[PDB]
C-alpha cells in the first residue's frame, strides 16, 4: 500500500479543525489521489 495516502487519511480522520462534511470532503480528496 501507499504509506503517504495512509498517513494523510489518518490525519484527516482525527483533525480537530474539521466537521463531518469537511472531514468527509478531505478524505474523499485523499481517496481520489493514490
Partner 1 sequence: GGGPSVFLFPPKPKDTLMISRTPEVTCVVVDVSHEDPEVKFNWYVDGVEVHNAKTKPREEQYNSTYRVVSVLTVLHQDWLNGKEYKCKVSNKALPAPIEKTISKAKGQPREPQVYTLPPSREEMTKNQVSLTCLVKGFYPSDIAVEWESNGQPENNYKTTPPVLDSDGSFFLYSKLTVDKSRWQQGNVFSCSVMHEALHNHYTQKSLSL
Please report, as ranges, the residues that interact with partner 1 according to CB under 8 A.
1-3, 5-10, 13, 23-24, 27, 30-31, 34
CA 32 → CA 4, 21, 23, 27, distances in Å? 13, 16, 14, 9
CB of 10 to partner 1, least distance (A): 5
- Give residues with Cβ within 8 angstroms of 15, minimum separation 6: 23, 26
CB of 16 to partner 1, least distance (A): 14
Distance (Å, whole) CA 3 – CA 17: 23
Please identify, using beta-carbon distances, which residue of 1 and 16 lies nearer to partner 1. 1
Please identify, using beta-carbon distances, which residue of 2 and 17 lies nearer to partner 1. 2
Amino acid at each position: 500500500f501507499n504509506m503517504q495516502c495512509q498517513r494523510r487519511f489518518y490525519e484527516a480522520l482525527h483533525d480537530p479543525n474539521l466537521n463531518e462534511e469537511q472531514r468527509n470532503a478531505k478524505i474523499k480528496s485523499i481517496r481520489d489521489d493514490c
